[PDB]
Amino acid sequence: YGIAQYREINAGLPTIVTFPFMFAIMFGDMGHGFLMTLAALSLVLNEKKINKMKRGEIFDMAFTGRYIILLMGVFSMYTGFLYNDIFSKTMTIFKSGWKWPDHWKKGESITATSVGTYPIGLDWAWHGTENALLFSNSYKMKLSILMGFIHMTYSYFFSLANHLYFNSMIDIIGNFIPGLLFMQGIFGYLSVCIVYKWAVDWVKDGKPAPGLLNMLINMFLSPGTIDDELYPHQAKVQVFLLLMALVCIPWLLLVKPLHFKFTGDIMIHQVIHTIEFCLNCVSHTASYLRLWALSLAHAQLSSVLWTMTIQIAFGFRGFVGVFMTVALFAMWFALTCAVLVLMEGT
């Protein structure tokens, strides 16, 4: 993208973790994560053999990013474990937090009862249910928003540390602080609201679980009015946050140029910067929904590749069954490597 400015914080050091882990969020399958980890391990264990060897272009790219591929694979195994997904199947590591009814008839619709929480990962009771995607889409959408918010906050604090290193306190006062307050008081508030709504048992308390999208939209369109109350004194906190965020726009747009003029091109530069930052603070939070989007597409592609091909083989017996299983595994592995590892991976 670009060469770092002299002595500013290097983006590669955070990238080491954040890039493979964001990939892993969008590539959350333990099976394909393990496949790509195996490819990367073959690259890194034979590293000295592959060094001083004529590679070409694709092999050269794979070798140069061998550790990138290694961390992408390891984190993809971890995030597939958290999604509880391996080649579209699920692990049954721990006792489920869901208890199915004691008795039911063949083909009856049954709804489970929450008897606990799955220790790590999505509970395997959701595999094969008719509302699995209903729960996992909410989970992964909020997960995308939260991880994107954390990533953006970390990067903006890198901007803080740059300002401290270059001793540009004017940037801290007039560029960092208003932007931090804006971004927190809107989207960090949204993120903490997501976490808090997760923490509150609405069914047990008898309170209606508020729609957070509706909450956020009415925070701006209808200040001071709460449809479903997430927490006590919500109206006052929300109006304070809205006034803070609204004030932070003149803050950013004026405090630095007025510091220049009262103590030119800095005005228009700061106005452009503030417009860009205000647009970015919303557009980038929205853009992190691609984590959930690609995770959903990856999981659906894994499911369709499994239900087609290899799963069909399991219903046959005899020599025809054995040959069909062999051929359909070959087909499933080829499409897994070409579509899931190669297309979805890229």
Binding site: F87, G107, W124, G128, G321, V326, F329, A330, F333
Partner: protein
């Protein structure tokens, strides 16, 4: 040629994955025989998948010998 190595990789993955699948079918795992649409046979599917894994093992041994020889 690379055909032997590619078949060796695919056959090793076949042995591993089909052995795991056959074991899960034999133990009547939730993720594989839990559903009504899933095969009712169970261990009978496990036997077929074991035979397929053995076929992939034969392919793996043959191609692994060939690639070392070549």
């Amino acid at each position: 040629t690379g055909k032997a190595w590619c078949c060796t990789v695919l056959s090793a993955f076949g042995v591993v994955i089909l052995s795991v699948i056959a074991h899960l079918f034999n133990t009547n795992h939730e993720s594989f025989v839990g559903s009504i649409n899933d095969p009712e046979d169970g261990p009978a599917v496990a036997h077929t998948v074991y035979l397929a894994a053995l076929v992939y093992l034969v392919f793996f041994v043959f191609c692994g010998f060939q690639v070392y020889l070549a």
